[PDB]
Design a protein around this ligand. Structure first.
Ligand SMILES: [Mg+2]
Ligand SMILES: [Mg+2]
Ligand SMILES: [Mn+2]
Ligand SMILES: [Mn+2]
Ligand SMILES: [Mn+2]
Length: 270
């Protein structure tokens, strides 16, 4: 009752091992839950490039993920996307918002990912994902997510230019110390729920991601979110940005923590 989709094409990756980390996470889920992943996209080396070149390069992978996610969302399984980078959500979030216009998105992330081409100082596509899905800028992959239905969970050291866009759009922010079961349940109210997680939300030192933001959420807080959301309301879950070689000891330890965090939801759907 889980549909596993795995991105393996480059989508703006600047870190070296996020494709391998997605592959390793997928394999752990296949072994634990008896699944067969649907693998999409062809790998490519990482690079420190501007969004205006990385985004066109990623079109084929993004369209293939959109197609697979749409097929799963139309049916009754729990849609689970294991994504190399959070930028895959530029393709999936518009599908979620079109299919489930009543859904609330829990965007669980150490950053706000709310920059636009005008505000970004890095040029990094991964910092523009949520603003793209909400239509503040045109990614070429659609929009349609109402910012009133998007909730940033765990975000912290947000710069003031990005915080200004967040407040103007009306995106709610729950900081890590406040991201308890009660607060997340208050945020989703009575709506179907989509969860999109970037592992940089966590306190650094456990799961290697791309960015290291101090004073993050603990793994037990993530598990408490998955325990609190009723299975009947959970549409799907995206897991992004494990940065570890697929053959490494660290990828093995990291997937163990990941499996523990997601077990309340995935066990219910298994
Ligand atoms: Mg469903
Ligand atoms: Mg329909
Ligand atoms: Mn992040
Ligand atoms: Mn992110
Ligand atoms: Mn990240």
């Amino acid at each position: 009752m889980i549909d596993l989709i795995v991105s393996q094409g480059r989508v703006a990756d600047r870190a070296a091992w996020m494709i391998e980390g997605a592959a390793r996470t997928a394999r752990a889920l296949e072994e634990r839950y008896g699944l067969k992943g649907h693998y999409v996209g062809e790998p490519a080396p990482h690079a420190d490039d501007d969004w205006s070149v990385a985004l066109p390069q990623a079109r084929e992978t993004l369209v293939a993920v959109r197609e697979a996610a749409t097929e799963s969302i139309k049916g009754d399984n729990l849609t689970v996307l294991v994504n190399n980078t959070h930028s895959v959500s530029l393709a999936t979030l518009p599908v979620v918002a079109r299919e489930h216009p009543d859904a609330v998105v829990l965007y669980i992330d150490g950053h706000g990912d709310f920059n636009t081409p005008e505000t970004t100082d890095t040029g990094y596509l991964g910092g523009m994902v949520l603003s793209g899905a909400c239509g503040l800028w045109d990614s070429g992959h659609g929009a349609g997510l109402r910012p009133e239905q998007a909730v940033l969970v765990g975000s912290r050291d947000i710069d003031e230019g990005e915080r200004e866009l967040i407040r103007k759009a009306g995106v709610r922010v729950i900081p890590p110390g406040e991201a308890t079961a009660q607060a997340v349940l208050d945020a989703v109210k009575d709506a179907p729920v989509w969860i999109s997680i970037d592992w940089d939300v966590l306190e650094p030192g456990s799961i290697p991601a791309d960015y290291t933001v101090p004073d993050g959420m603990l793994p037990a807080q993530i598990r408490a979110v998955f325990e609190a959301i009723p299975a009947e309301r959970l549409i799907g879950v995206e897991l992004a940005e494990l940065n570890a070689p697929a053959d490494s000891e660290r990828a093995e330890q990291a997937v163990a923590v990941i499996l523990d965090m997601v077990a309340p939801a995935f066990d219910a759907a298994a």
